[PDB]
Design an enzyme around this catalytic site. Structure first.
Site, short mmCIF file in Angstrom:
data_model
loop_
_atom_site.label_atom_id
_atom_site.label_comp_id
_atom_site.label_asym_id
_atom_site.label_seq_id
_atom_site.Cartn_x
_atom_site.Cartn_y
_atom_site.Cartn_z
N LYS A 23 39.55 21.99 37.69
CA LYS A 23 38.67 21.13 36.90
C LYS A 23 39.41 19.87 36.49
O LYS A 23 38.85 18.79 36.50
CB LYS A 23 38.11 21.88 35.69
CG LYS A 23 37.09 22.96 36.09
CD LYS A 23 36.52 23.69 34.89
CE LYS A 23 35.36 24.59 35.32
NZ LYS A 23 34.83 25.32 34.13
N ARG A 73 30.32 22.53 40.32
CA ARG A 73 30.38 23.60 39.33
C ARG A 73 30.24 23.03 37.91
O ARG A 73 29.54 23.61 37.07
CB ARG A 73 31.70 24.35 39.50
CG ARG A 73 31.98 25.43 38.45
CD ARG A 73 33.02 26.39 38.97
NE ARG A 73 33.70 27.14 37.90
CZ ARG A 73 34.67 28.01 38.12
NH1 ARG A 73 35.06 28.25 39.37
NH2 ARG A 73 35.25 28.64 37.11
N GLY A 100 34.07 34.90 28.64
CA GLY A 100 35.21 34.71 29.51
C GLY A 100 35.50 33.23 29.64
O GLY A 100 35.54 32.70 30.74
N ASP A 131 37.08 35.51 24.94
CA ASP A 131 37.94 35.94 26.05
C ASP A 131 38.86 37.03 25.51
O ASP A 131 38.77 37.40 24.34
CB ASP A 131 38.79 34.76 26.58
CG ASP A 131 39.10 34.89 28.07
OD1 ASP A 131 39.87 35.79 28.46
OD2 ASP A 131 38.58 34.07 28.86
N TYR A 132 39.75 37.53 26.36
CA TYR A 132 40.75 38.48 25.89
C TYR A 132 41.62 37.87 24.80
O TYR A 132 41.93 36.68 24.83
CB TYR A 132 41.70 38.83 27.03
CG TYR A 132 41.20 39.69 28.18
CD1 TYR A 132 40.80 39.11 29.38
CD2 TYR A 132 41.23 41.09 28.10
CE1 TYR A 132 40.40 39.91 30.46
CE2 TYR A 132 40.82 41.87 29.16
CZ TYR A 132 40.41 41.28 30.33
OH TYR A 132 40.04 42.05 31.40
N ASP A 181 37.58 42.14 24.66
CA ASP A 181 37.65 42.59 26.05
C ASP A 181 36.24 42.97 26.42
O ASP A 181 35.73 43.97 25.91
CB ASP A 181 38.56 43.82 26.15
CG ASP A 181 38.64 44.38 27.57
OD1 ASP A 181 37.86 43.96 28.46
OD2 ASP A 181 39.50 45.25 27.81
N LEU A 182 35.59 42.18 27.29
CA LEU A 182 34.18 42.40 27.62
C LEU A 182 33.89 43.73 28.32
O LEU A 182 32.74 44.13 28.42
CB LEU A 182 33.65 41.25 28.50
CG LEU A 182 33.64 39.90 27.76
CD1 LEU A 182 33.35 38.73 28.70
CD2 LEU A 182 32.65 39.92 26.60
N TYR A 214 34.61 39.46 37.85
CA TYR A 214 35.78 40.33 38.01
C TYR A 214 35.53 41.73 37.49
O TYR A 214 36.33 42.64 37.72
CB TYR A 214 37.00 39.72 37.29
CG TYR A 214 37.33 38.36 37.85
CD1 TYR A 214 37.10 37.21 37.11
CD2 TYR A 214 37.82 38.24 39.14
CE1 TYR A 214 37.39 35.96 37.64
CE2 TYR A 214 38.11 36.99 39.68
CZ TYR A 214 37.89 35.86 38.93
OH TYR A 214 38.17 34.61 39.46
N1 LIG Z 1 36.72 41.80 30.39
C1 LIG Z 1 36.92 40.53 30.02
N2 LIG Z 1 36.99 40.21 28.68
C2 LIG Z 1 37.22 38.91 28.27
N3 LIG Z 1 37.38 37.92 29.22
C3 LIG Z 1 37.31 38.22 30.54
C4 LIG Z 1 37.09 39.52 30.97
N4 LIG Z 1 37.07 39.50 32.33
C5 LIG Z 1 37.29 38.24 32.75
N5 LIG Z 1 37.43 37.45 31.65
C6 LIG Z 1 37.75 36.02 31.60
O1 LIG Z 1 37.07 35.26 32.56
C7 LIG Z 1 37.85 34.08 32.80
C8 LIG Z 1 37.71 33.75 34.28
S1 LIG Z 1 38.47 32.17 34.77
C9 LIG Z 1 37.04 31.13 34.35
C10 LIG Z 1 37.18 30.46 32.98
C11 LIG Z 1 35.97 29.63 32.51
N6 LIG Z 1 34.76 30.45 32.41
C12 LIG Z 1 35.76 28.46 33.45
O2 LIG Z 1 34.86 28.49 34.29
O3 LIG Z 1 36.49 27.46 33.37
C13 LIG Z 1 39.29 34.41 32.43
O4 LIG Z 1 39.77 33.59 31.38
C14 LIG Z 1 39.21 35.89 32.05
O5 LIG Z 1 40.17 36.29 31.10
#
Ligand SMILES: Nc1ncnc2c1ncn2[C@@H]1O[C@H](CSCC[C@H](N)C(=O)O)[C@@H](O)[C@H]1O
Length: 672
Positions: A23, A73, A100, A131-132, A181-182, A214
């Site tokens: 980005k 995007r 996330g 996020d985490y 943690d999602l 993910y």
């Molecule tokens: N279970 C979960 N809990 C919290 N965050 C999660 C997660 N699984 C994936 N993510 C978050 O999803 C992000 C993906 S990278 C994309 C980052 C942002 N949405 C963008 O588009 O710029 C990461 O920071 C990752 O930590």
């Protein structure tokens, strides 16, 4: 055990390093070149503002295809938010909840009152970043210690330090950061309530931008379902598809790439397609869905924007871009009927007879290059130029055998040689004794005008008359009088030329048909001396958006000095809408149509290669066996067709930075 989970989690957090840097590449190269209309980030004095710079340690550069995809995007999320902000009554609070979020500075970009390009977001929009914990700790520390970011959300701008670097939440009137943690659906459900997101007077916009991708489908679905219970909510998800299954050329490479980085794409294995996403959202409590892939988003950009985007940097990887775009979905769902998907935001949402006369086999031809060209000069086959992965000017001589193809380099004897190039044409002339090299390019901003003849006997190159206009991705074919027809390409020159070999003259023979008002790029082209007719198949236009869905039948009258080419007939079919295809007459009544890419979707086992009877207007499929589809590297971009039986040789693609694939080689033979 827990070590495994911690590692998996950190690997997923690391994907944010890649996306934030990409980005930032767009912020560096694209945004300074886009007018106020699509800048995302500008102040009252027309000066660009930067936000991604705060979160990225170095200058970043990516390939043109990758940059274009990341601009798209950014445009994807912004367009969806715009649609919500524009339609929701101006007295309502809107809360954008980014699931996330990584280091995405979107909330700061949108809340910054210096950013006149986000004015509609300055008053009633708030943000929640999720996020985490480990990742949020870093983000929050950056926010609190960078004056420009702190000021936007009303924190002290006099601090370049924090009292406690382990703080993983942040609370301000318009911006919250909340750790979750999602995968813990229960904790997430609690979080929604702590943030009072159940208030029906507040419109929610949940965003999952390549984040839920993910997660296992059960876990991502649990998040989606939890948000569905919040009255008056939107869910915007942007993530990968595998529309034709896990073994499609690009899909195969994509899935392997994410697996190798220990961040596998898990939800896409359940939700392969656009339709599967509609059903998913409906099941999970969102009844109203507007969904399309990224190419539909590109097609929806207005013309002025398109014009500027094409000018940002050199680009000529449209096949790669087609493939990438069909592998990312933008899905916008709502749980309330009052929200309309209006005209400007709405996305629009066959079994051929299997051929009985010809079949497709493997036939190794590891020339391992793409976008060269090849022709047959007697019993011999000569392939010149292309890239592997850098451009060359080398000639390979090919000796074809039923089982494989032999190749040797041809040493050249002249002091002067044509520069290494790709996207040229190479055509037999001079009663099978010479080869004509027309046009081509180095980099995409380096179209060429210098033409050459290679003499097989002496192995000497000689430069001939140059084109008046540079031209690449044109098509060419030999005519029965030995002259060469040249069609389209990226060029300011005539839509169709005839090169008279003996006279050493180029003639504009653009037919008197409105089809030829625009130059046709990477179209299939062949001429049949027997039936005295030729065909133009597909082809894109210089807007890099539109692709013709026509097969154009034409004839050639050598004795007509002014208008030798005339159109006989136009056939229209969705399977003709291909860019970068090649065609060859198997028989005067049977045209083989191979490969290329399409703006409307991905080709598969059944329609990558088809056959057309131009007289009776019938179509058959020449299927690619499960075996070769799954087990071999197929990639029908930048390949060539040769017939002494038709061999499909060369080709390949870079799959959006998920790795490169080389087309191994195929052969079409008669069924006994
Ligand atoms: N279970 C979960 N809990 C919290 N965050 C999660 C997660 N699984 C994936 N993510 C978050 O999803 C992000 C993906 S990278 C994309 C980052 C942002 N949405 C963008 O588009 O710029 C990461 O920071 C990752 O930590």
């Amino acid at each position: 055990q827990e070590r495994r989970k911690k590692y998996a989690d950190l690997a997923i957090q690391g994907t944010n390093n890649s996306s934030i840097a990409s980005k930032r590449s767009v912020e560096l190269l694209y945004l300074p070149k886009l007018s106020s209309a699509n800048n995302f980030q500008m102040d009252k004095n027309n000066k660009l503002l930067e936000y991604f710079k705060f979160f990225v340690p170095k200058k970043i550069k990516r390939s043109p295809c990758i940059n274009r995809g990341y601009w798209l995007r950014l445009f994807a999320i912004r367009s969806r938010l715009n649609s919500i902000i524009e339609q929701t009554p101006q007295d309502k609070k809107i809360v954008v909840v980014n699931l996330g979020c990584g280091y995405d500075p979107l909330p700061f970009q949108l809340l910054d009152t210096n950013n006149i390009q986000s004015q509609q977001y300055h008053d009633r929009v708030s943000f929640i970043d999720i996020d985490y914990s480990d990742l949020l700790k870093i983000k929050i520390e950056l926010i609190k210690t960078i004056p420009e970011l702190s000021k936007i959300i009303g924190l002290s701008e006099d601090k370049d330090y924090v009292d406690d670097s382990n703080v993983d939440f942040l609370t301000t009137p318009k911006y919250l950061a909340r750790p979750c943690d999602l995968n813990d659906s229960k904790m997430f459900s609690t979080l929604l309530n702590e943030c009072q997101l159940y208030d029906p007077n507040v419109v929610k916009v949940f965003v999952a931008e390549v984040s839920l991708a993910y997660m296992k489908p059960e876990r991502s679905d649990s998040i989606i379902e939890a948000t569905s219970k919040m009255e008056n909510s939107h869910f915007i998800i942007l993530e990968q598809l595998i529309p034709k299954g896990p073994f499609e050329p690009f899909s195969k490479q994509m899935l392997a790439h994410f697996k190798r980085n220990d961040s596998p794409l898990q939800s896409v294995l359940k939700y392969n397609t656009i339709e599967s996403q509609v059903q998913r959202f409906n099941k999970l409590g969102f009844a109203y869905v507007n969904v399309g892939d990224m190419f539909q988003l590109w097609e929806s950009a207005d013309e002025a924007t398109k014009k500027e985007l094409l000018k940002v940097e050199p680009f000529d990887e449209l096949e790669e871009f087609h493939l990438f775009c069909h592998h990312y979905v933008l899905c916008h769902a709502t749980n309330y009927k009052e929200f309309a998907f209006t005209q400007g935001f709405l996305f629009d949402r066959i079994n051929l007879t299997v051929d009985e006369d010809y079949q497709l086999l493997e036939c190794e031809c590891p020339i391992n290059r793409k976008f060269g060209d090849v022709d047959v000069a007697g019993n011999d086959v000569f392939y010149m130029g292309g890239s592997n992965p850098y451009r060359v000017n080398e000639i390979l001589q090919l000796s074809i055998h039923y089982d494989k193809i032999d190749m040797k380099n041809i040493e050249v004897s002249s002091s002067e040689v044509p520069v290494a190039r790709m996207c040229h044409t190479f055509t037999t002339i001079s009663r099978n004794n010479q080869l004509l090299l027309i046009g081509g390019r180095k980099a995409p901003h380096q179209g060429l005008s210098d033409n050459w003849i290679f003499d097989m006997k002496t192995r000497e190159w000689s430069m001939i008359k140059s084109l008046s206009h540079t031209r690449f991705r044109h098509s060419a074919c030999s005519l029965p009088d030995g002259n060469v027809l040249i069609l389209g390409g990226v060029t300011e020159g005539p839509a169709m030329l005839l090169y008279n070999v003996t006279e050493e003259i180029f003639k504009d023979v653009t037919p008197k048909d409105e089809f030829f008002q625009n130059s046709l790029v990477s179209a299939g082209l062949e001429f049949d001396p027997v039936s005295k007719q030729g065909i133009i198949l597909g082809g894109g236009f210089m807007d890099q958006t539109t692709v013709s869905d026509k097969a154009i039948i034409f004839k050639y009258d050598a004795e007509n000095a002014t208008e030798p080419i005339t159109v006989i007939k136009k056939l229209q079919h969705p399977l003709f809408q291909r860019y970068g295809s090649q065609i060859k007459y198997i028989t005067p009544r049977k045209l083989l149509i191979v490969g290329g890419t399409s703006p409307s979707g991905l080709f598969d086992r059944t329609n990558s290669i088809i056959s057309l009877d131009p007289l009776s207007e019938t179509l058959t499929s020449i299927p690619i066996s499960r075996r070769i589809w799954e087990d071999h590297s197929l990639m029908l971009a930048g390949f060539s067709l040769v017939s002494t039986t038709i061999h499909i040789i060369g080709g390949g693609a870079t799959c959006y930075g998920f790795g490169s694939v080389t087309n191994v080689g195929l052969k079409l033979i008669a069924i006994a």
